Swiss-Prot record, chain A:
Description of how the protein assembles with itself and partners: Homotetramer. Can also form heterotetramers with RYR1 and RYR3. Interacts with FKBP1A and FKBP1B; these interactions may stabilize the channel in its closed state and prevent Ca(2+) leaks. Interacts with CALM and S100A1; these interactions regulate channel activity. Identified in a complex composed of RYR2, FKBP1B, PKA catalytic subunit, PRKAR2A, AKAP6, and the protein phosphatases PP2A and PP1. Interacts directly with FKBP1B, PKA, PP1 and PP2A. Interacts with SELENON. In cardiac muscles, identified in a complex, composed of FSD2, CMYA5 and RYR2.
Expressing tissues: Detected in heart muscle (at protein level). Heart muscle, brain (cerebellum and hippocampus) and placenta.
Compartment(s) of residence: Sarcoplasmic reticulum membrane
Family: Belongs to the ryanodine receptor (TC 1.A.3.1) family. RYR2 subfamily.
Record's signal peptide: none
Domain of life: Eukaryota
Function: Cytosolic calcium-activated calcium channel that mediates the release of Ca(2+) from the sarcoplasmic reticulum into the cytosol and thereby plays a key role in triggering cardiac muscle contraction. Aberrant channel activation can lead to cardiac arrhythmia. In cardiac myocytes, calcium release is triggered by increased Ca(2+) cytosolic levels due to activation of the L-type calcium channel CACNA1C. The calcium channel activity is modulated by formation of heterotetramers with RYR3. Required for cellular calcium ion homeostasis. Required for embryonic heart development.
Domain writeup: The calcium release channel activity resides in the C-terminal region while the remaining part of the protein resides in the cytoplasm.
Disease implication from the record: Ventricular tachycardia, catecholaminergic polymorphic, 1, with or without atrial dysfunction and/or dilated cardiomyopathy: An arrhythmogenic disorder characterized by stress-induced, bidirectional ventricular tachycardia that may degenerate into cardiac arrest and cause sudden death. Patients present with recurrent syncope, seizures, or sudden death after physical activity or emotional stress. CPVT1 inheritance is autosomal dominant. Ventricular arrhythmias due to cardiac ryanodine receptor calcium release deficiency syndrome: An autosomal dominant arrhythmogenic disorder characterized by syncope, cardiac arrest and/or sudden unexpected death, often in association with physical exertion or acute emotional stress. Patients who survive manifest polymorphic ventricular tachycardia and ventricular fibrillation. Unlike typical catecholaminergic ventricular tachycardia, arrhythmias are not reproducible on exercise stress testing or adrenaline challenge.
Name used for this protein in its record: Ryanodine receptor 2
Full protein segment contained here: 1930 to 2010 of 4967
Induction of expression: By TGFB1.
Post-translational modification: Channel activity is modulated by phosphorylation. Phosphorylation is increased in failing heart, leading to calcium leaks and increased cytoplasmic Ca(2+) levels.
Length: 81, 67
């Protein structure tokens, strides 16, 4: 619940700030908005593709930390470690 | 494409649908990709014939759990 709330508000902020700089970027807005114009499942997988390095993920570290800590807690609950 | 321009991202998607998509993506990319090596330890534990002193009889060699 709250993780996707944070992701949604962050994505709104990122879209807003990208639209702020579209004039100065000119044709350069393209790859940046490739993320914004994509199927929702692909958006989810791109936002979640930060498990092992792979810096090609727009999720900031302060939001990555929540998912990493919850994954650690889930693994401990499952008894993996 | 007109439809691709009209279609809206997660921040316009409803909360519960976004949660469902996040759950599916989390299962696909984090839970499934997790690996932990337990086969060797499990097979050794199954092959270990235990409880010999509380058995105390050994009339016939009881088959181990792996057997």
């Amino acid at each position: 619940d709250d993780f996707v709330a944070k992701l949604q508000d962050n994505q709104r902020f990122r879209y807003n700030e990208v639209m702020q700089a579209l004039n100065m970027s000119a044709a350069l807005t393209a790859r940046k908005t490739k993320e914004f114009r994509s199927p929702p499942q692909e958006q989810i997988n791109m936002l979640l593709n930060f498990k092992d390095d792979k810096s090609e993920c727009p999720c900031p570290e302060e939001i990555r930390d929540q998912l990493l800590d919850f994954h650690e807690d889930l693994m401990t609950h499952c008894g993996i470690e | 494409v007109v439809a691709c321009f009209r279609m809206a991202p997660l921040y316009n998607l409803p909360r519960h649908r976004a949660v469902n998509l996040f759950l599916q993506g989390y299962e696909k990319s984090w839970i499934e990709t997790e690996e932990h090596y337990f086969e060797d330890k499990l097979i050794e534990d199954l092959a270990k014939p235990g409880a010999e002193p509380p058995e105390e009889d050994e009339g016939t060699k009881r088959v181990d759990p792996l057997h």
